[PDB]
Amino acid sequence: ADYQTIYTQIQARGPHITVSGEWGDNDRVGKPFYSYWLGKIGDAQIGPIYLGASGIAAFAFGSTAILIILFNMAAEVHFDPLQFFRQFFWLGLYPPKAQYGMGIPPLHDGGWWLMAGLFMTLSLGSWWIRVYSRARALGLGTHIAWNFAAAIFFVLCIGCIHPTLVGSWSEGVPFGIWPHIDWLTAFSIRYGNFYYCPWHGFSIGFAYGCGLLFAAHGATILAVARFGGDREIEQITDRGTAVERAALFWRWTIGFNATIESVHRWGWFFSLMVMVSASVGILLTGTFVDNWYLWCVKHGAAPDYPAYLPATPDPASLPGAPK
Amino acid sequence: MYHGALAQHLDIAQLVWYAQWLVIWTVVLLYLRREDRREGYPLVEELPYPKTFVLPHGGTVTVPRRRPETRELKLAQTDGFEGAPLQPTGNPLVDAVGPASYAERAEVVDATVDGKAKIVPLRVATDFSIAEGDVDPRGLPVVAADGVEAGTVTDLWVDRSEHYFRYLELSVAGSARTALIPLGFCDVKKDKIVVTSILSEQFANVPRLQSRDQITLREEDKVSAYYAGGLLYATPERAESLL
Amino acid sequence: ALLSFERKYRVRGGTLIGGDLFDFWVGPYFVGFFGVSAIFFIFLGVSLIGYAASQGPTWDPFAISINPPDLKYGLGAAPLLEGGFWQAITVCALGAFISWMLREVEISRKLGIGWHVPLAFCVPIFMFCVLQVFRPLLLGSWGHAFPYGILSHLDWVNNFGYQYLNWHYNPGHMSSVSFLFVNAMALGLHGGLILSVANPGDGDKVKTAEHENQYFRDVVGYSIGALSIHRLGLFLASNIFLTGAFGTIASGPFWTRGWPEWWGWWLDIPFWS
Amino acid sequence: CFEPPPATTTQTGFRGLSMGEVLHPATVKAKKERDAQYPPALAAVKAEGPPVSQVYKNVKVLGNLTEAEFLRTMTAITEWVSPQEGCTYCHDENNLASEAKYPYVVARRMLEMTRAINTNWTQHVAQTGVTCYTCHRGTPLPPYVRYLEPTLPLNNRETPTHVERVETRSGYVVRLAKYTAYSALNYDPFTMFLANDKRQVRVVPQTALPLVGVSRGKERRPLSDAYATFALMMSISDSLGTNCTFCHNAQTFESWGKKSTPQRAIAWWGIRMVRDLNMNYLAPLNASLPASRLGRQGEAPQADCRTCHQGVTKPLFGASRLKDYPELGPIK
């Protein structure tokens, strides 16, 4: 067995390396320290971290959003500390309950929610600049930034684009552990069962697909760690037996295979598509589909089942029934 | 009237469904599956135009490689059937066939970002050490699959780019040499390093390095492959059925 | 037929059972004893699906469904058309899965690599068994298992959740979902990183292992490492089902109320009630 | 934290839909024992004699009974409502025709309410019906009532904690939660849906595409309505000690026919019945009950599903006294 694939038997220590970026070298902060136990299942060095204007801006905008949320939560328990701590999961910051359309809602009924959302959006945008600019500073491709962009875009879809397209801030996601959860069901119910949204299915296949691919890829690299398969950049530019055996394991199993470079394209694509699929689904929801189940019924796709208990007429349709 | 309704019994969500499928299959079949063919092709016994990488330390490479030389395989076919397995004609560990196979990697030293040799023994990497609390294997006996002492650990080889030990170096008992072994083939105990991949005698033919204090990408391949070959070839029983 | 680097690896050996008998290739695919048994179970399973499906009211892929028995049949045999086909197909599914896994072990051995992938493949097989075998046994009827149909199996998942009022509050579910999310996120990060290093853009130099660790130290103040991200990835993915399994098997056998109410253990502690 | 096996499970939909009840035997046992306390019917009495409209001075509703029959009903009522206090809960001991005590006037109206339920709402109560006991369970104040704000504990025979008290504002979210099966849904489904007939429980479209004129901006219902409906349904579920699949195939909540069970239609009639009881019999009693019975907005206690059902899909597991007391309905 390869014990190294479980944990690092013998850890190494060294002078810490700093690779210069085109700018911002002076804005790296912190004294690096070494954790023995972390060192068994990752690199032992924690820190330093890069600051920079966009990272700072992210913390300022994001902390503001979080402060607005937490303060409104505390009010919901009338500023009792014990109850705040107890009831925390049930507390939340809600979008407008009344229909004011796209008018900016009153503070007590949606206005604080909208404000926290504005600051969260600024925080996300700021962090994206960081993720993008750091790559450019280090002469790296912007693969991570563009994947991140899609995730941000999905958040904007459920947060303000769908609300804007159907014209009501009431459709947005609340802030809160259970309350943002409650929205999932409310939204699915309203639009006719999200199991019947095809983009929900696409998103799920890709989400499950990322599970499959990282289990398979992670396991594969561990399995060829004996040949240094983890050194994947130089395995790309100079194929080693690690990735020859990896390719052949899969070729012999499923009849075809990837390369050490291309498997990362598959993973990146699958990841991306969870968010691209979700976004399109949300954008079609409410705008051009009001009931996904009935949309499937329209197109003849929905499964049907025999009666078990006897069919039940809608009593609201019966003669002389009350309203 | 309905939002999203079009001519016929047709609607917009319906149209986007076909577009979605088209995009996915185009990406998969016309791009991703072509990126999959940058190594191992053309087959022997649909392809993208070549990709060229500018290397970090001078020079370029274009993949897949065309090597100016190719190796002669000491293998015999077991039958005339197209899909029949091959069979080693000699010692498969030294001949490097099957799981003892290595790749024709560059005979260049893997480098650090600042251009120094990446994989080096601690006698060269004097600014590196083993973390407090972990076993220092130097001076410990190496015990092979047959329970015989094959040698004594003389050094560790560290990756200076990732701060990660990748090989032990041991004096081979009765053969006036040292051999490297990847740490994946070592079970590190307090008083010994256990190696079940090969028998004690088989340490004698581990591929040798050209220089004592550095190692090339091909040499790393050769060394790693040798022990892997042992998993199937160390003894006659290992090539046979488990049950 | 062979990849350019394939021939040297095409040796005999690494089998669990059979010996040389099944130790050969059919095109790119390795066979082995478990390749034979895999094809056997697959052929048998697909045949049963076809025979059962012809007896139904539709050939539409979305609408076809092969369902388990009524609850009242318990853990016994059921008539072929009233749940028996389901029972047989289930057996074939399990045989194919386990065969596939063991075949991968034989291929690992031949290649001189670790058995990480087949071990990983035991996870989704394990979860299937939790859904179709272990939970139904505990509840006392095969009829609690999910049906085999493209859209119908979604209706099962859906009703099952709502039987416990709000399944989102299921604590094993919360863990399962968290792992689904973090894994997909980590795959995007990792895939993106490796491509960003090998494809710097323009005509720039490919970067380094040092650059990898610098990027993530800069962005989040920590980089886990090249090998370690492959251990982490496998751990995160696996735990989608390893943790999920607890929430699935708890629902019914160990809990019959709605899931939100479960959290009363915390909410209803006397001292803050 | 958890409940031990084995579990009682039923099937309420086609095999392989996972529709059906999931019950804990110990819980069902406790409830069966509690409901078994229902006093048995009083023995039959003499059918011949003058009607009490002749014999007695101030009989308005039960005037056609014979004296024996009438006094039997008085005894039954006492058992069901005020067994510990006896006749004098409602009566001036020295003048039985006097309406001087508030319980008397309320009780007359409750006789009318009960007869109305068993006559006019058989689409819900069927031949099972209700007696005073169904709600009261042997006390003047029924154990499961609602005010125009959430209250805890759900059972008013239980002593409240400080935080459970309606005056303690920090406990509001929990009072809301425990009425919607512990969900964090921020809606009171009682006042929203059961106190009156103002709101529409249905929230899902019956068209595949969005209908023009109802689908944009201020034409739209707010999504809040979908949360509020879900809150009522969590409350309904808990009050009947069941789950959604007792009434719906979750495939399509909004569909009837093979997608709903017979129980769902009965429940529909139940919502209409509750609204009649509240609007026309219970709410107006605030004029007749003392200040000490009223809520903080001057409201009389009112009824929801739990009032009768008390955690079971059928009240008292379907126990009936209908044949034993024809004077409680159905009325010819």
Ligand code: BCL
């Ligand atoms: C408890 C949770 C549920 C469940 C809840 C859901 C939900 C929710 C959704 C799905 C969806 C899917 N599920 Mg499911 N699903 C469950 C168990 C299964 C099992 C099984 C053997 O147990 C299988 C084969 C499937 C298969 C499927 C696919 C039809 C679909 C996409 C998955 C995907 O891309 O994954 C990753 C794998 C890949 C990317 C590789 C490609 C795999 C291909 C697509 C599998 C095709 C199998 C097909 C049905 C043929 C069966 C074999 C025949 C005999 C030939 N599910 C369990 C019971 N499933 C999605 C959908 O769109 O439904 C129609 C979806 O939204």
Ligand code: BCL
């Ligand atoms: C009863 C409820 C419904 C339901 C309601 C919904 C609704 C509504 C939606 C989904 C969506 C999805 N559902 Mg669903 N879903 C149900 C059942 C399922 C089942 C199942 C087995 O039954 C599965 C596998 C899924 C799976 C999924 C996901 C794959 C999919 C995408 C969401 C996602 O990845 O977000 C996880 C990722 C994110 C949220 C991205 C976050 C990224 C950002 C950048 C991170 C920022 C962090 C930052 C630090 C935070 C700062 C905040 C501070 C305040 C400042 N659903 C049932 C039927 N589901 C989504 C979808 O695809 O719709 C088409 C969606 O909108």
Ligand code: BCL
């Ligand atoms: C109202 C409905 C419910 C709901 C009801 C359920 C129920 C019930 C269950 C889950 C479970 C899960 N839910 Mg859910 N879930 C809901 C909302 C969500 C949301 C969301 C965004 O709101 C998300 C992200 C999820 C996500 C998830 C998953 C993480 C989790 C595990 C799925 C699984 O077991 O697959 C299983 C997949 C398999 C078993 C696949 C097996 C594959 C085999 C080994 C290979 C097959 C080979 C194939 C046939 C080959 C074909 C040949 C071709 C050539 C390829 N759910 C809502 C609230 N969910 C499960 C869980 O773990 O609960 C804790 C579960 O039991």
Ligand SMILES: C/C=C1/c2cc3[nH]c4c(c3C)C(=O)[C@H](C(=O)OC)c4c3nc(cc4[nH]c(cc(n2)[C@@H]1C)c(C(C)=O)c4C)[C@@H](C)[C@@H]3CCC(=O)OC/C=C(\C)CCC[C@H](C)CCC[C@H](C)CCCC(C)C
């Ligand atoms: C956490 C663990 C994750 C994970 C991990 C891994 N996943 C692996 C490996 C690892 C490590 C591999 O080693 C192996 C592989 O080779 O990689 C390509 C594999 C594989 N993952 C597949 C599907 C897959 N993974 C899913 C989930 C996860 N994967 C989770 C997320 C899901 C979901 C989510 O639904 C699906 C659909 C196949 C492509 C492949 C098996 C092929 C097979 O075993 O051949 C043998 C079996 C057949 C060829 C078919 C048998 C026909 C039966 C008898 C008749 C059908 C009956 C059936 C029940 C009807 C259902 C229909 C209805 C639901 C509509």
Ligand SMILES: CC(C)=CCC/C(C)=C/CC/C(C)=C/CC/C(C)=C/CC/C(C)=C/CC/C(C)=C/CC/C(C)=C/CC1=C(C)C(=O)c2ccccc2C1=O
């Ligand atoms: C004809 C006959 C009866 C023959 C008998 C012999 C026999 C047993 C034949 C098998 C026949 C059967 C049943 C074939 C079906 C095989 C299957 C299950 C095919 C499904 C293909 C699917 C859906 C795969 C899903 C995963 C997916 C999206 C993969 C694409 C990306 C790839 C190829 C990832 C694999 C891959 C990974 C994960 C690496 O880490 C890695 C590292 C270094 C080099 C290469 C690789 C590599 O190729």
Ligand code: HEC
């Ligand atoms: C309420 C909770 C009551 C209890 C307990 C008892 N009685 Fe009653 N009684 C009640 C009402 C509302 C009425 C009027 C109903 C009507 O039909 O109009 C009555 C009426 C009587 C009468 C008729 C007297 C008359 O008007 O002449 C009698 C004789 C009577 N009640 C007797 C009685 C006895 C003996 C009781 C206990 C042993 C008893 N009542 C309890 C309300 C309630």
Ligand code: HEC
């Ligand atoms: C629910 C479905 C009920 C049925 C059936 C009957 N009663 Fe009732 N009653 C009910 C409520 C919710 C209330 C208000 C709470 C309260 O106790 O005030 C009542 C009230 C009365 C009272 C007044 C009690 C008091 O506060 O002193 C009486 C005397 C009374 N109810 C009697 C009564 C009788 C005799 C019934 C049937 C013959 C009857 N009630 C039916 C709820 C319900």
Ligand code: HEC
């Ligand atoms: C009866 C025994 C029911 C149980 C248990 C649950 N529901 Fe229900 N639901 C029921 C009825 C009679 C109605 C219609 C009310 C009316 O005025 O006609 C409903 C309604 C819903 C809806 C809305 C349907 C619509 O068209 O908009 C939903 C979305 C719904 N119910 C969901 C639901 C859930 C999730 C349940 C358990 C958790 C649940 N219901 C229980 C009857 C009954």
Ligand SMILES: CC(C)=CCC/C(C)=C/C=C\C(C)=C\C=C\C(C)=C\C=C/C=C(C)/C=C/C=C(\C)CC/C=C(\C)CCCC(C)C
């Ligand atoms: C101490 C540690 C380190 C940090 C603490 C974290 C903490 C306690 C946070 C607060 C409590 C918690 C956990 C809350 C959780 C909330 C969750 C999970 C919320 C989830 C989702 C919320 C979403 C998607 C909200 C989205 C909102 C938007 C997209 C808004 C967009 C708004 C605009 C575009 C405004 C423009 C219009 C203009 C006219 C005003």
